[model samples]
Target chain A: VHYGLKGITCVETSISHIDGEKGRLIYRGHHAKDIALNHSFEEAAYLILFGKLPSTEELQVFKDKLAAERNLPEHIERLIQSLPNNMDDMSVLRTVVSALGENTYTFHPKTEEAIRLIAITPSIIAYRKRWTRGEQAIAPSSQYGHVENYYYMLTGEQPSEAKKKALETYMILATEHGMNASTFSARVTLSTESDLVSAVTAALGTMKGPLHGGAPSAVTKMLEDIGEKEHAEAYLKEKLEKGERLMGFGHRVYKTKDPRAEALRQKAEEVAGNDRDLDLALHVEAEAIRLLEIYKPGRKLYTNVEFYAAAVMRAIDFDDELFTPTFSASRMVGWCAHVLEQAENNMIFRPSAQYTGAIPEEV
Target chain B: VHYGLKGITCVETSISHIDGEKGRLIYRGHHAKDIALNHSFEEAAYLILFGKLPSTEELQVFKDKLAAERNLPEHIERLIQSLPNNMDDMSVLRTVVSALGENTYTFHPKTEEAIRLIAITPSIIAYRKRWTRGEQAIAPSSQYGHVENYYYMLTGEQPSEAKKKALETYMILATEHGMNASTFSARVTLSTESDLVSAVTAALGTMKGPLHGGAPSAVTKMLEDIGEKEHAEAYLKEKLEKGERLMGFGHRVYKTKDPRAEALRQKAEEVAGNDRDLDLALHVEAEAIRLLEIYKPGRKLYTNVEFYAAAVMRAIDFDDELFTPTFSASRMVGWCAHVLEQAENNMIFRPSAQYTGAIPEEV
Candidate 1:
């Protein structure tokens, strides 16, 4: 039996695809790079959920629905504020999603509710983060788009065009991937015919894991540790000699490069005009790839998405703590899409286990 | 490419085992019936976690650790109270587990953290339920064992010897099952090196699904619909003819009777004592079995765990809403065991998906 279902194709999905060898990701039928670069986060989400890009009128209606649900209810706000100040943002997001299950009257999962969840998640993160900092919670603005509104809610000012575009690109690219642990978590919950919030809550928790959602933040740390380009080779070489795994490199599935990384590398180039972190990250990516070639020949380790995701996050002034929550905020769209898909042809995911124990006998 | 990972053995565990052909369950090589009937919930929990029965001193120290962590911190208490009144118990439980992740100072997955989560979960459910009903939260008493304290915390009164034994039996029976969806959820989260709270939160969400933890409550509803012996045949026959599922009648794994159901059936007989719901449930089980043979001959659709689980819940005067949450409280022990097991052989669960999407094209 394959461990961790590593090569198991458990479910059929049209939401997203990751072709590791080709370093490609697809949302619906479009390349993720195309969507991330050319489309709004709203458009990409609608495409993933509905299986096609919306028409002008459909886009208007979808945007309206998303904007309408951005305002948090009073009870939800209180619940968010009541979370301990020390709690991580991802846990807070998980709690907020579960609390939303209470506010929702229906048990049946629906597409509209998917939109509502995707819309309100960023607000939950922003509200909780700001509340902990003793800053007033900023309500979502009706005039702002999804990515723009997320930034606006977290910081009480309108984002510059460059910042908004960078955030949108990062969010769009981070939205979906094929059969990741967190997406699998959402689908596993949905397989039980559970409600959307429950499924999404499961995903948030799964995503908080170090092997999954903890990657981008670790990439930030890796870049910080390899602070100067001159120190990059020694830091990476010594770390490798200690048998420590390098963060932001060597993806399990992608043999060449993560396509999302390729996309965000381009985004980093666009945003890295004079940013020190982005410049250091860009230089380290080359050095790390070169060092891996020297130390572990034939084992091709490449810069993965987290490498550039960290750069994009820093370029947009996101704190290291906010990286995973921002990732969760984006991936909630994909999680909801998978949840809805699992509900369409529901099967309870009950896998058998082989007993490696003593034979059954009367006690 | 098995859909839903059916027939796949992802990991090895000694915690629990299910024998479908023989209708048996084993926890640490002992029959589930042996543990459920002969052992206390605390003892079974020890066996599941440590692979052996605890000595007198070991049991005492374990009990003390569990009891010491039962009282929720003031902030966690307030956070649980802040959940809306309209939320279902399972969703409330999911929220509470995720919120607990925030209060935890350490991110490492450990056995102590597991015990704390299992210990405090009953209080989370009971306190949240009571607060919604305008009742004050009950502090868990060190005077009681794990099972006794669970009942006491929920009702704020010392349970009778019979009720205590009955509840303990049900809880022990429900505590561990081999690689079920909720247990799998916990393992999946832990496989990613996530903390215990995240793993438990994922399990709570997975359990909320109607096909899994939702079954016991549905069993209660099914019996209520078939209120009498005379009503049983027609009710079941009509539902079968209409192609509706008889809730408590079948098992996916067990072709014979479920051993947990067999165990709970014995408890039902001991505690039934002319309770109408339990009486009806017992009758429905027989009729449903008989009618299944008639409707779908050669399909051994035996009564599963949920049937007797429902009866025991009714026998103990537990409302239908409490069935799943109470199930979660007991199962948290097993979830913790599986989590610790997964952490011991830590592997990030990165399953693959075969993308049946559009052919890749350059962006």
Candidate 2:
């Protein structure tokens, strides 16, 4: 019996692949780094969802459809607004996403529904954030591309090209990873022949866990704790000495640096030129690795995507509160892709459990 | 690596045990049959939640706490009413559950939260169902016990003792079973150290799938197709000839008759008093088993719980639409117990997957 199914390969997929040993992530026959840098968010989403890069005509149509879907239905908007004032944005997002299942007559995993989920998520996150802050909610602009609309709705400001490009790259890189907890949650839900929204809801709940989607926010806190480059080593030394984890360092699968981490680092440098948060985050990365090598000896502790993900988010002026929900917004496409895949070749995931509880004799 | 982690013991628990080979189910060292027939839903919930059958005083306190928590807060009720008219009861339940996480400043698996979830679920289900039917919702009765209150809220009619006892037994038996898919989803969500509401939300999504919690409704439909005892043999032969599955006939775990099926068979007779639905269900069971022996010898195709569960639900006047959500209401206690157990020995359920997609060269 494998605890946590560690090193177990449960299903075969062509959506995304990660080679932890080689420090690589590939999305549907294209490197994630290539897609993140060279393509737009729509293009990456198309590849992950439909399993191939869209043709120029297909790409334009997909972009237009996504743009058309950017606005939430009036009733759905009310549903989001009606949630308790104290609800966290992620919880709000999860509830709103599940509630979307109401609009459909059946739970089919169609591209239109996939696009709707991906498109509406940013608005949900931003609307909830605005409501919490007592600011007027902003509607997503039809003219803006996906990343620009996300930022514009959140901040009510038009983003510069660098800022748009950086967040765009972060979203693309975060779009899919092979069978992470949230993606697995999506697949498990779909395996029961449930609707796409339920699968996405399951994924959102799983992602809310601190070990998964919650990490970027923690990374934000860690960077703030370091505060300056001068304190990086001492701060990390104390955390490691107390046997606490350095939140954004190392990963479960990646023996080398996470490729997405490398991609986000470059993106952060390009957009936040000589920015304090980015510089301090980079400083901590090097210092944490050094201290870990001294303290833990043989373990390969490296900067994970969350480290630079925090830097890029902060560089783009996001609060820690927005971190996980933004990640959910990006990862929705991946969750949809996994859900569709499970539906295509479905099996009810009723795995047998080893009974360790009381028995009939005890009864 | 095992597909679906079959035969892998993921977590240890004393909550429940199923001897699939012997067709036995035990809850905290007591047989499910014993508790279902002898105890109330409150007693079973107490045993599952607090790990023992409650003393008389403890049972009263627990019952009082549950009754006190029965009514939704004004804001929460508004939130439920604000959901779209088209929303299904399950979707509304999922949204309402996740929204509960908003009221808490942090996600802790406390007994109060568990009772709140279990107590409030029946209200959520009945409210959404009634709203869709254009009927004003009935408030939960403070005077009724848990099972009686569920029926009272759904249909505003005080239930007979026999009807109440039948439903109560079903609820107790449905409360917990080892690591089923929905229960596993709850545990996986909690393992991320998420709140109890998120864990329950995850389980609800998983339960919405047809392979898991969606079966009772299907069983009802199956029986309806058979129509009467005279048609049972012909229906069984035709379905087996076409190699179609008889829903609820066989289970993944039980090689013999499901103990719950046996318990429910007895209870259905006690309450139904020679009702056509129960009689037809029994005839179909016998015919299907006989044909299975002739058509596919050596296969263990015994009646599973859902067959009789459908009968009991039907005998209690529940429509098929109410079947799965009602099951969810009962299973909430189990979901909460599993969530708390997961939090007590929290480990992030991050399993590894074999990547089969593409690498740099392939890209």
Candidate 3:
């Protein structure tokens, strides 16, 4: 029950593999790039959920079924609309996810309802975001893939094929990692015989932390705070002097580059059109890396994918607030995967506290 | 890292010793029974928070100071009010805790805000419940202890001295234990350099599970389903047939008997207020025990204290819906103690998965 490897071993299924040395990311056994670059969101999801790429016909049916369920439940739509227009988008997404539990029709993990949730969670999230902005949630259109449908639903317009393809790839890439913080929290909750929503709610709570899913988004904020390249050196020096961690530079794992960082960065750079903001963001990342290499030598600070992801998302027209929710919307797949895996071999995650306090003095 | 006795060999300090076999519970080497029966809720809380029993004047000041921090920020109150009423109370608590991050005056793990939160959470919960009911949120008065103050805010009236005493005792007995699910969630969140609210949000998410704080409330719901002895046999048989676990029967730990059970049961009896429902509950318990011995002996399906505690709460005026929330109100003390302990030698909780299916998978 106790493993000395501690933070480094996958005690359950290795749904994903990382080779930091080689900078390769493989989920299950397939290369991440294979699905992200080539497959539609539905196809990639099918591969992740059902463990195989769907046939063209199966993919159509899966897309159609998800599209059919894209109408937000009336109560949920109203709930979303009730949130203040100025409220944080992540908070809005969380509220929507928690509210979805009220309409939950299944309890067993990975059952039809669970899978349906995995399929439709993005729809629910997009609809809520649009609804809060006084825009009617657009129904999933027959003309689009999941990524395009998401854009259409929120923006009432179809995304270009290349942009949608990039978004789809990003989703597949973000879908799951072997076991991350939120996924672990979700598994821990499920290990107690609780329902999937409870587990997800638990994971959402973990993801709300600035250090996890929120870190990438914070990198965007940091870049924005530095404001101009002229101030980049001083800003870096000031943060270093204050002992502030530059958010996207270091990961607990990966002494070198974060594998996901490279994938996301590539997607982001591909999406970086003629937008001045995107160019500014690129400048920030280049300066950040240069400053880190000089100031914190051998400490292994590098350009994490999230630094570029902010630019990609901004270029893609996503609200800065939606960055982590987008990550959450994608990562729910892995959270569900790990939760089901833990359920199969349930262990109460009851760890003992190595108390370091002194005993009461003898009378 | 694989020290099997992580909980066992930890040095004891201001924390309690549980003599499980003898049904004796002590905190910081003092009898828990003494504190419960004689001390105020604030007194017990002060004992745990500060690691020593306070003098009478000290307890008075402590109670007043905590009570003064009861009112939540206006935006937060609005956030709570705006959430769908049907959302899980635990989720609501998590949302509130997470939202509290924006206004956090303290971000350090062991800080004044953490101390204030340990003292003030009960008030937050009490106010949230009442506000949702369209009742005015009660302000915590310096004149009372934790139990009396809770009852005061809840019912808008002072509790009887006896009732206050019982509530205080329940709080003391539940103040702290070994690192459990909710506490682990809290520790994990805080180790990421997050604030108490983030840690508590994770804690609330963990507490929402059926196998944790969610059980006792369901026990009350179960008794309602088994309204009379006539319903008991059929109900038990039906649940057995459906493989539905009867809540509040057995626990994951404490093989013999839960020591806290008797104390909680006794307190429940005191809170009964001469209601005949107490007698009916007693009758039901007797039959439940008899049936368990005959049909569930090997399963060790004995009624834990919550079975009786439910009856006592019912006999008194506590809302059945608030059972889990009430459980959390008391359990937050335990969470805070564990958080403090973990911070001394903390590590992030990132465990690996089993990796069953694929030669490769990615998410």
Best by TM-score: 2
Residues B308-338 of candidate 2 have per-residue lDDT tens digits of 7887677668887787899999999899988
Candidate 3 lDDT (Cα, 0 to 1):
0.64
DockQ of 2: 0.57
* Fnat: each model in turn: 0.77, 0.66, 0.35
* Candidate 1, position A280, lDDT: 72
* Candidate 2 CAPRI classification by DockQ: medium
Report lDDT (Cα) of residue B11, candidate 2. Answer: 76
Q: Write the per-residue lDDT of candidate 1 for residues B77-148, one digit (tens) a residue.
A: 877767666778777888777887855524467777888888888988888878877887788899988888
Point out the higher-scoring one by lDDT: 1 or 3: 1
> By descending DockQ, how would the candidates be arranged?
1, 2, 3
Between which residue pairs do clashes occur in model 2? Answer: none
lDDT, each prediction: 0.80, 0.80, 0.64
Give the distance in Å from residue A297's predicted Cα in candidate 1 to where it truly belongs: 9.9
> Against the true two-chain complex, what DockQ does each candidate achieve?
0.60, 0.57, 0.26
lDDT by residue (tens digit), candidate 3, B268-306: 566565445555566666666666776666765556766
RMSD of each: 4.0, 3.7, 6.8
